[PDB]
Design an enzyme around this catalytic site. Structure first.
Site, mmCIF file in Angstrom:
data_model
loop_
_atom_site.group_PDB
_atom_site.id
_atom_site.type_symbol
_atom_site.label_atom_id
_atom_site.label_comp_id
_atom_site.label_asym_id
_atom_site.label_seq_id
_atom_site.Cartn_x
_atom_site.Cartn_y
_atom_site.Cartn_z
ATOM 1 N N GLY B 29 0.888 -1.225 -0.010
ATOM 2 C CA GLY B 29 -0.018 -0.013 0.004
ATOM 3 C C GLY B 29 0.694 1.220 0.074
ATOM 4 N N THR B 30 0.086 2.492 -0.043
ATOM 5 C CA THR B 30 0.683 3.681 -0.080
ATOM 6 C C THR B 30 1.285 3.952 1.450
ATOM 7 O OG1 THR B 30 -1.363 5.123 0.621
ATOM 8 C CG2 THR B 30 -1.286 4.547 -1.827
ATOM 9 N N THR B 31 2.036 4.761 1.487
ATOM 10 C CA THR B 31 2.724 5.057 2.955
ATOM 11 C C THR B 31 1.828 6.008 3.625
ATOM 12 O OG1 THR B 31 4.838 4.885 1.689
ATOM 13 C CG2 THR B 31 4.978 5.452 3.944
ATOM 14 N N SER B 74 -2.915 2.022 5.567
ATOM 15 C CA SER B 74 -2.083 1.614 4.320
ATOM 16 C C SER B 74 -2.583 0.157 4.049
ATOM 17 C CB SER B 74 -0.565 1.666 4.271
ATOM 18 O OG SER B 74 -0.259 3.067 4.663
#
Lengths: 241, 243, 231, 244, 240, 250, 235, 195, 111
Positions: B29-31, B74
């Site tokens: 996932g995104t940070t 995330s």
């Protein structure tokens, strides 16, 4: 072999999921130890805070179940808390239904029965934990009662749990062969705590600072956990000895 | 073998491989980060700008719980929303009965116990998020990070997703050189920086910064989003620190 | 491969294959474009017939006076999801005398699609939706997907060869974003977008479906003779 | 989910057989043999115990022969525990009938309902079938003396003489050979024992490996009596028919 | 409760549990029904590796559903009792509400519906049974004969057979039954019914059952003696 | 969530074995030896308290449990399974008998109920069989003294004397040698101790042996006086001291 | 084995796609829509000549203004017809009017996808739903177990359908009379029917606004068959 | 409803039941048959609350007919009566009880005995030589006490009934429009066509 | 004891011409001897050229009109934007009201 996935018997009459749940018990790489004084019951567990980002105060495996009962868990934290909340609920229900504080051994039995059900019914997995229950019971005095993922339980004079548990065990058996008695013959809990830590040091071959331990004490009519400072004071007392 | 095909099955290791697989989707996932400060907590996230067609400012991911708790995550975003919905029911229920808003450790366990319940059966899948959350209560500030196994702890600072190691590296630095504290306003700048920094491990797409915070002095113990002059100010701070 | 028998199983790399296969039905579906200005939002959808003797599948469904969507994938799943949305718009009205914010419609769809991706014996939704509306904060376009992921956009496109229109809109962005207070011009730019996704065929009169909502425009669907004007 | 661990106890084989019924029968074929013989003036039930140990309490046990009501009894071949579940059901069912009509239950009606319960376990619910076959011996004022068998499939049939459990192919041959229709109960008794004597997997047939019961009109004018033989009464019958 | 979809489609579009239920019908004792000008006759094979059979009390293979409707079957005996019960229950319920006994088509339609329902409900397998349902609608002299099978499809037959070697006896009925001229009497019809079973049976000893149904709830089961005459008369009309 | 295992986990294999009952019996075979002997004036049940750790207090672990004032139980196999069975067994004596007839059930019927519970775990959905065999010793006015063995299948059989678990094959042979129908209770206790000496490795004393009897009524154990027809429990647990007295005269 | 509600890697429901195969094995059903009425015709396919063909009911009335034909596992149709009739009469009860043909079809197709782990499998039968309503005149709908329904000017389902549809694709024009359409259905059936078409092994029906859904008896159909050979022989 | 009687003589059971059906101040019908044949040799007359009477009779009838078909056998009158009693004994503690009183007149073929059973809506069963439900009993029981003999023929039984009906037409306040008489004997059930 | 009904007064009146129709209602709303409002409309345009008033207990009147307005909206969705004829509206309302036969809407309804 789907007899290795759910809690049904294998050809040699075994429940592998129960066996693998015992293995999870040691994932935390933490050893725990409990002894009984004359007036008290002490339970110590190693405290290890690897990441620097953690808030060290929230990192605990000792739980306050009731006013009088404390519990140390050996196993992963999610299962540990599942067991903690449940034990709290059961200890509170018992007090409301029956009009007296739930005894340590009875709570131990009830949690053991719960664990047993997961070994028999297929949809529930066992919890990968071992629960060590401590109190000064009003009928039986200082008490240690321990529950595993098999649904087994028994009372102890003293006990240990974890990876290096066998060393701590034999260390304690050795002390009791010598001492000739059922417990630590000591007046105050402070000196029983010192004993507990001292014999954990001998058996593990390591020293501890104040942040490497976490200590639980049960006296008549309360269980409480020591702060860092309470343990420092305890460690200093050991130093000058 | 085949121990990894069903949730709640213990492997011979003593592991639940489905929870460990859940973690990969989280790591994918995104940070997103969170920073504990003197009298509050700050939250921030990287939002990959998939395309120019994404309306800027309008795919908000930080989600409020009650009036005092921020939650960011995330991983699989729908899984995250599901967890917050549950969290909101828990805080509604707790307030309904006890009158006082839900304390943060109390709230932490409500999410903790629920997520953990999705590792207990084979008819459910574990959560595909690690969730950073917290806020201010009658005892002060609290930040938590919760993982798909239901494991959670209190954090000084925390990070998850693709840039977690770059983020964690920068967080350890803050912790070391500010052992007496970090102000709420400072943490908003630091947060911006660390998201810009942790975006290097994820840099095909350029990204949108999003911050929020609860501070007992700055937002009066309520969860508000960072917007306008204060957002831009921290965006500029971070832009300095990458060159 | 071994981890694609159900929605409740993660792959070793952390994927949900039943969700990805659900996403695949959209990819197979006929193209539909959505785009918006500050005053209106338009849906253009290419309808697909069974053969020369069949009607063209409806792609656009009205949800309220101020909201609606277009579908690509399994039509029945869109019927279920649109129905659910019609109910949430209703509920908002009868209880709060409040027209449902497109942003909330997004969140509600996301959570409904999500339940199906985490529990046993269910299945993900096999359809993709583009939601246009005009609420208290202007014109909106949303992209729904059966993973649960809802996305607010100026414009987009989903289905077969959607990539063409999706890039064109990305090129056209600054032009169409400001077709304010002109219905016909937003529609034609939508028609132009969808044309980027056509092969060996172009837009006929019972082939093409257009919908518009905006400031003083109820969500209304144009079909048949009333889209000849736009080809 | 859980599907992966489901045996599917209630499905057909490609040949249209119920696997679990077939395997239950194969289980039942290793059980102690039970024999029913029906005479014009009564019915005999004889069953062989699963090899006894010298230390088992002989008289107080009931492994094979059970009382359903005053007019009906069953001989069991299969899993005893399964049999007991079904027997308590049959007993209750006979009492519901008596309560409803103020008449003892007709033998077939009881048999049919037990067979219908067995049938259910092979069609719905996904549970394993009952690993049990019964020999029903009983009497009612419509058909007089009757013998039936039911088995895990829920199928039931009527008999003049029949066997269940082990060596039923051997036993049915010997019964088919010597059974006559005019036969009196006392001859049927002798047939039952002579037949077990030959088909048994034991070296010799003794009193302490047998359960024996009769249903006669041998009391007071047109009223029926059930006799579950004590150890001694079997031991005497074994000598009087000359098998010891 | 138990949920599993036991009856499901395979890649070739076949539902194997329904088809395997048909295999159980194949293995069941034979059954034939033939309808005359003024009657219907039901005949059933009785498998003969069994003497010591107490036929006073053993379930007759033809069952009365109402006093004007009879049902026979091939397949699992246990399954058949369940259908027969529901059919009998429905028969009495139709009398209670419509104030009229069931038509034979209705009774068939109901039993067929039951079988079909068991083909797409979770946790149940299909009935391993096909049926022959025969009788006379109330105040109607035209004979009726219907077939049902595990899938739930049903239809009307001038004459028909099910069970083991039904292909053999269908063969016989197909060239020996004139649609244009049904067996004009009870006598004639019984003979054609027994003749057909004799292609497949063995000796017509304790091996053939016959039930005759006439109009207005006039059903009578034949006995060894009467059957045996048709058997001897069939065999001495064979020597050609 | 909730149980989705509504199908049996014990099913017939092609040979007609019930796999899970077979394997439960194998679990019982591994279990520590336990036995029971029936005298003319009482019954003895006995087993070894093989302690896990020496730090454990094995009196807090009762392998021999009172079920009713006149009935006692012991097992071989899996302890946790036993413990819950005892709980259910005690309760079913009340709900399905004492609350109805105002008296405790006779031994064979309490056994019958226990057997039923164990049969249901052999056929009900989503459970495994119980991994224990039980020996239930008991008294009741009309049947006198009795001893029953109950297996994972749900089967039960009455015994003059028997043993189960580890050294059950040897133990039964030894009991056959010694058992006669004129044994007085003390004679049976003596024999029980001898038989149990065979299959005990280490220490053999009153702290490693658990032994209870169904014998004479004990008014001193009733807890109250004044009702002459209530005379107290026939189930008595022998103390550590009491066991050691009989070991000197062994 | 694997869940009943599972998607294939191509993004299709296994169980639905397999039902579609079962329908291809079914007997042929054809419908044609005209401005004078909609015709529905079927192959009876009697499995043996002892079966009384008039007892093969594959064309069925739903309401006076709606008829339906079937191809596939025809026993699966009973509950679909029952729901349809209930829905059509019910609608008239609530609204004192005839239900729309599309609405009725939408109602039937809502059933289709509610199976899983509700019923245990999809339906293995397709339906041609033909009717008339004031709003959109004469309509023919193909109702599948996918829960999708298409409107057609003409359609064939069952085993002879790829051949029949190609035949229909040429022969249909928007001014077919009812007569022409009857003959067309008869013509295309005889082509794809294994055995030879007569009034016993094929059945015709129409629905008109004036007289509603009528099934044709074998006399009337036998005359359309005789009529069909005469047009054919004479070219 | 109102009047239902029964007399068991030597070889038959005779059931007489009034023909009137009344709502308010209107005799809606004067030829009502307050009887259902449960089985060929068992007849049940009924009286009580409007609607409940017929619904009950027909429900009972259906169950006995089902039983007959299932077992190809006719239940004895005693067995039918116990079944009916139990159904009424259930109903009385239900949400809305069946308010129906019945007489069951049957000829038991096995015993070759006629049998008359009187059962009220509480499920109170008694076997009787003669019985009545409602106000009828207050006249007929004492009348029958005096005139009834156990060994009477069927013809004498009918004459005893004429005495009962004459008296009821003399002293009863309501017009019940005569009775319909039915005889249950070894040859089944038949009705006397004028009375 | 709680009385779930009340009387909000007012009066309504409908008349049919050849090619027109009226529905009149006063705008007064009362309880007991007090005026609640001098202008509280109780005659509504319900779409599809139908006007409706449910006079009596106001809370019930509003509930009914709301539900009928919702009925019309759903009729459009479920039946391809078809116009709801007055007779079909009439029949629909019968089912709305009779639905609450055992706890009625205390209103006199005219469309």
């Amino acid at each position: 072999g789907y007899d290795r996935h759910i809690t049904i018997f294998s050809p040699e009459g075994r429940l592998y999921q129960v066996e693998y749940a015992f293995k999870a018990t040691n994932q935390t790489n933490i050893n725990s130890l409990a002894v009984r004084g004359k007036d008290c019951t002490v339970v110590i567990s190693q405290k290890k805070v690897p990441d620097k980002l953690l808030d060290p105060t929230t990192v605990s495996y000792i739980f306050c179940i009731s006013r009088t009962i404390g519990m140390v868990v050996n196993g992963p934290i999610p299962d540990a808390r599942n067991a903690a909340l449940r034990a709290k609920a059961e200890a509170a229900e018992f007090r409301y239904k029956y009009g007296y504080d739930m005894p340590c051994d009875v709570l131990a039995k009830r949690m053991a029965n719960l664990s047993q059900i997961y070994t028999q019914r297929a949809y529930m997995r066992p919890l990968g934990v071992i629960l060590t229950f401590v109190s000064v019971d009003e009928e039986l005095g200082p008490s240690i009662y321990k529950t595993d993922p098999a649904g087994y339980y028994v009372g102890y004079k003293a006990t240990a749990t974890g990876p290096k548990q066998q060393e701590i065990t034999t260390n304690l058996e050795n002390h009791f062969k010598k001492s000739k008695i059922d417990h630590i013959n000591e007046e105050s809990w402070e000196k029983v705590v010192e004993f507990a830590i001292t014999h954990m040091i001998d058996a593990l071959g390591t020293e501890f600072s104040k942040n490497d331990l976490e200590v639980g004490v049960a006296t008549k009519d309360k269980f409480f956990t020591l702060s860092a400072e309470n343990i420092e004071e305890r460690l200093v007392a050991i130093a000058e000895q | 073998t085949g121990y990894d095909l069903s949730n709640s099955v213990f492997s011979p290791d003593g592991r639940n491989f489905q929870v460990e697989y859940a973690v990969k989707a989280v790591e994918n996932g995104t940070t997103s980060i969170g920073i504990k400060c003197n009298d509050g907590v700050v939250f921030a996230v990287e939002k990959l700008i998939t395309s120019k067609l994404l309306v800027p400012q309008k795919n908000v991911k930080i989600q409020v719980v009650d009036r005092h708790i921020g939650c960011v995550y995330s991983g699989l975003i729908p899984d995250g929303r599901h967890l917050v919905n549950r969290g909101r029911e828990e805080a509604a229920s707790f307030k309904k009965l006890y009158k006082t808003p839900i304390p943060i450790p109390a709230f932490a366990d409500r999410l903790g116990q629920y997520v953990q319940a999705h590792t207990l059966y084979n008819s459910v899948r574990p959560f595909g998020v690690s969730t950073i959350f917290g806020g201010v209560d009658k005892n002060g500030a609290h930040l938590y990070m919760l993982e798909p196994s239901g494991s959670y702890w209190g954090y000084k600072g925390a990070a998850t997703g693709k840039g977690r190691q770059s983020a964690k590296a920068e967080l350890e630095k803050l912790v070391d050189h500010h052992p007496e504290g970090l102000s709420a306003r400072e943490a908003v700048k630091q947060a911006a920086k660390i998201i810009y920094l942790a975006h290097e491990d994820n840099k095909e797409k350029d990204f949108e910064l999003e911050i929020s915070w609860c501070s007992l002095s700055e937002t009066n113990g309520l969860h508000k989003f960072v917007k306008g002059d204060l957002l831009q100010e921290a965006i500029d701070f971070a832009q300095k620190e990458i060159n | 491969n071994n981890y694609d028998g159900d929605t409740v199983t993660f792959s070793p790399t952390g994927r949900l294959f039943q969700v990805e296969y659900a996403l695949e039905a959209i990819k197979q579906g006929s193209v539909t474009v959505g785009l918006r200005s500050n005053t209106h939002a338009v849906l253009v959808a290419l309808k697909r017939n069974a053969d020369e003797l069949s009607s063209y599948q409806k792609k656009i469904i009205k949800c309220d006076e101020h909201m609606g969507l277009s579908l690509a994938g399994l039509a029945p799943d869109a019927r279920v999801l649109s129905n659910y949305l019609r109910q949430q718009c209703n509920y908002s009205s009868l209880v709060f005398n409040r027209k449902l914010a497109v942003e909330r419609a997004g969140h509600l769809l996301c959570d409904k699609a999500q339940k199906n991706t985490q529990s046993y014996g269910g299945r993900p939704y096999g359809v993709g939706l583009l939601i246009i509306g005009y609420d208290k904060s202007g014109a909106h376009l949303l992209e729904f997907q059966p993973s649960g992921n809802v996305t607010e956009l100026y414009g987009t496109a989903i289905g077969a060869r959607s990539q063409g229109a999706k890039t064109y809109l990305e090129r056209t962005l600054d032009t169409f974003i400001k077709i304010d207070g002109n219905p016909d011009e937003l529609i034609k730019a939508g028609v132009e977008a969808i044309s980027q996704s056509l092969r060996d065929e172009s837009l006929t009169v019972d082939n093409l479906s257009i919908a518009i909502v905006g400031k003083d425009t109820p969500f209304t669907i144009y079909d048949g003779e009333a889209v000849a004007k736009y080809i | 989910g859980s599907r992966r661990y489901d045996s599917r106890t209630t499905i057909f084989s490609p040949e249209g057989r119920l696997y679990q019924v077939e395997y239950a029968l194969e289980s039942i074929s290793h059980a102690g043999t039970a024999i029913g013989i029906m005479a014009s003036d009564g019915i005999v039930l004889a069953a062989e115990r699963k090899v006894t140990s010298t230390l088992l309490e002989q008289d107080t046990s009931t492994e094979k022969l059970y009382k359903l009501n005053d007019k009906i009894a069953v001989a069991v071949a299969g899993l005893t525990a399964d049999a007991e579940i079904l027997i308590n059901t049959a007993r209750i069912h006979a009492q519901n009938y008596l309560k409803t009509y103020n008449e003892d239950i007709p033998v077939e009606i009881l048999v049919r309902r037990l067979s219908d319960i067995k049938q259910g376990y092979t069609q719905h619910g996904g549970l394993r079938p009952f690993g049990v076959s019964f020999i029903y011996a009983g009497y009612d004022d419509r058909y007089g003396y009757q013998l039936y068998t039911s088995n895990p499939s829920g199928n039931y049939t009527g008999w003049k003489a029949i066997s269940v459990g082990a060596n039923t192919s051997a036993a049915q041959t010997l019964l088919q050979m010597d059974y006559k229709d005019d036969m009196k109960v006392d001859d049927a008794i002798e047939l039952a024992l002579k037949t077990l004597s030959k088909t048994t997997d034991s070296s010799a047939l003794t009193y302490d490996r047998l359960e024996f019961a009769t249903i006669r009109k041998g009391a007071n004018d047109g009223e029926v009596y059930q006799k579950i033989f004590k150890p001694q009464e079997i031991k005497d019958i074994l000598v009087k028919t000359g098998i010891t | 409760g138990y949920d599993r979809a036991l009856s499901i489609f395979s890649p070739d579009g076949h539902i194997f549990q329904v088809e395997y239920a048909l295999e159980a019908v194949k293995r069941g004792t034979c059954a034939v029904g033939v309808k005359g000008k003024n009657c219907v006759v039901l005949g059933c094979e009785r498998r003969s590796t069994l003497k010591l059979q107490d036929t006073r009390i053993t379930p007759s293979k033809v069952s009365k559903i109402d006093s004007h409707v009879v049902l026979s079957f091939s397949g699992l005996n246990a399954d058949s009792r369940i259908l027969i019960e529901k059919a009998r229950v429905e028969a009495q319920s139709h009398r209670l509400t419509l104030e009229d006994p069931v038509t034979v088509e209705y009774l068939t339609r109901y039993v067929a519906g039951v079988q079909q329902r068991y083909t797409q409900s979770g946790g149940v397998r299909p009935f391993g049974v096909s049926t022959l349902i025969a009788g006379f609608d109330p105040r109607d002299d035209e004979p009726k004969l219907y077939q049902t099978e595990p899938s739930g499809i049903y239809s009307s037959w001038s004459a028909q057979t099910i069970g083991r070697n039904s292909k053999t006896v269908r063969e016989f009925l197909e060239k020996n039954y004139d649609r244009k001229e049904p067996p004009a009497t009870v006598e004639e019809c019984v003979k054609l019914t027994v003749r057909s079973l004799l292609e497949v049976v063995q000796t017509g000893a304790k091996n053939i059952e016959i039930t005759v149904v006439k109009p207005d709830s006039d059903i009578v089961a034949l006995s060894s003696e009467e059957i045996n005459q048709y058997v001897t008369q069939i065999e001495q009309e064979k020597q050609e | 969530m909730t149980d989705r295992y509504s199908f049996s986990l014990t099913t017939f294999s092609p040979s007609g074995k019930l796999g899970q009952i077979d394997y439960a019996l194998t679990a019982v075979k591994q279990g520590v030896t336990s036995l029971g002997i029936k005298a003319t004036n009482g019954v003895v049940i006995a087993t070894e308290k093989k302690s896990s750790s020496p730090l454990a207090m094995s009196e807090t672990l009762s392998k021999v449990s009172l079920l009713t004032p006149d009935i006692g139980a012991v097992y071989s196999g899996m302890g946790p399974d036993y413990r819950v069975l005892v709980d259910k067994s005690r309760k079913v004596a009340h709900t399905s008998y004492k609350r109805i007839y105002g008296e405790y059930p006779p031994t064979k019927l309490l056994v019958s109920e226990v057997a039923k519970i164990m049969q249901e775990a052999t056929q009900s959905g989503g459970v495994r069989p119980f991994g224990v065999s039980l020996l239930i010793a008991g008294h009741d006015e009309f049947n006198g003294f009795s001893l029953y063995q109950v297996d994972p299948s749900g089967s039960y059989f009455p015994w003059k004397a028997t043993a189960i678990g580890k050294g059950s094959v040897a133990a039964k042979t030894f009991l056959e040698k010694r058992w006669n129908d004129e044994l007085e209770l003390e004679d049976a206790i003596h024999i029980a101790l001898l038989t149990l000496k065979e299959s005990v490795e280490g220490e053999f004393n009153g702290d490693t042996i658990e032994l209870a009897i169904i014998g004479d009524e004990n008014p001193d154990l009733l807890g109250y006086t004044g009702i002459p027809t209530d005379k107290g429990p026939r189930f008595r647990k022998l103390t550590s001291q009491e066991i050691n007295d009989r070991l000197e005269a062994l | 084995d694997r869940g009943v509600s599972t998607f294939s890697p191509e993004g299709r429901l296994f169980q639905v796609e397999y039902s579609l195969e079962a329908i291809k094995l079914g007997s042929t059903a054809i419908g044609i829509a005209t401005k004078e009425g909609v015709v529905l015709g079927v192959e009876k396919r009697a499995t043996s000549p002892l079966l009384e063909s008039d007892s093969i009911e594959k064309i069925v009335e739903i309401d006076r203004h709606i008829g339906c034909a079937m191809s596939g596992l025809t026993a699966d149709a009973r509950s679909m017809i029952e729901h349809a009739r209930t829905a059509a009469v019910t609608h008239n009860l609530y609204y004192d009017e005839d239900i729309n043909v599309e609405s009725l079809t939408q109602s039937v197709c809502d059933l289709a996808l509610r199976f899983g782990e509700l019923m245990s499998r999809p339906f293995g039968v397709a339906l041609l739903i033909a009717g008339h309503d004031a709003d959109d005149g004469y309509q023919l709908f193909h109702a599948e177990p996918s829960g999708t329904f298409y409107r057609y000017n003409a359609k064939a389902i069952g085993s002879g359908s790829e051949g029949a549809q190609a035949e229909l694709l040429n022969e249909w024009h928007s001014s077919l009379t009812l007569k022409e359409a009857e003959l067309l259905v008869l013509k295309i059936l005889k082509q794809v029917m294994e055995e030879k078409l007569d009034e016993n092994n094929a059945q015709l029906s129409c629905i008109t606004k004036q007289d509603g859904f009528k099934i044709y008896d074998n006399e009337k159909t036998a005359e359309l068959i005789k009529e069909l050979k005469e047009k054919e022989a004479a070219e | 409803m109102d009047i239902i009687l029964g007399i068991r003589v030597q070889d038959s059971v005779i059931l007489a039941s009034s023909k009137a059906v009344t709502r308010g101040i209107s005799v809606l019908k004067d030829s009502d048959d307050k009887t259902r044949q449960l089985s060929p040799h068992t007849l049940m007359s009924f009286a009580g609350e409007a609607g409940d009477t017929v619904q009950f009779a027909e429900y009972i009838q259906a169950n006995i007919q089902l039983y007959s078909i299932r077992e190809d056998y006719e239940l004895s009158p005693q067995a039918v009566s116990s079944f009916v009693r139990q159904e009424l004994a259930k109903s009385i503690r239900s949400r809305r009880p069946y308010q129906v009183n019945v007489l069951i007149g049957g000829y038991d073929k096995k015993k070759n005995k006629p049998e008359l059973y009187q059962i009220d809506y509480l499920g109170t069963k008694v076997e009787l030589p003669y019985g009545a439900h409602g106000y009828s009993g207050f006249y007929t029981f004492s009348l029958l006490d005096h005139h009834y003999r156990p060994d009477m023929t069927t013809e004498e039984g009918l004459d005893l009934l004429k005495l009962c009906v004459q008296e009821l037409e003399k002293r009863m306040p309501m017009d019940f429009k005569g009775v319909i008489v039915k005889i249950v004997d070894k040859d089944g059930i038949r009705q006397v066509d004028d009375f | 004891q709680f009385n779930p009904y009340g009387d909000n007064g007012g009066t309504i009146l409908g008349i049919a011409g050849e090619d027109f129709a009226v529905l009149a209602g006063d705008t007064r709303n009362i309880t007991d001897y007090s005026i609640n409002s001098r202008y509280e409309p109780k005659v509504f345009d319900c779409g599809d050229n139908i006007v409706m008033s449910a006079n009596g207990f106001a809370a019930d009147g509003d509930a009914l009109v709301k539900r009928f307005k919702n009925s019309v909206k759903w009729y459009h969705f479920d039946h391809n934007d078809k116009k709801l004829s007055i007779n079909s509206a009439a029949r629909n309302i019968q089912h709305l009201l009779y639905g609450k036969r055992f706890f009625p809407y205390y209103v006199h309804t005219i469309i």
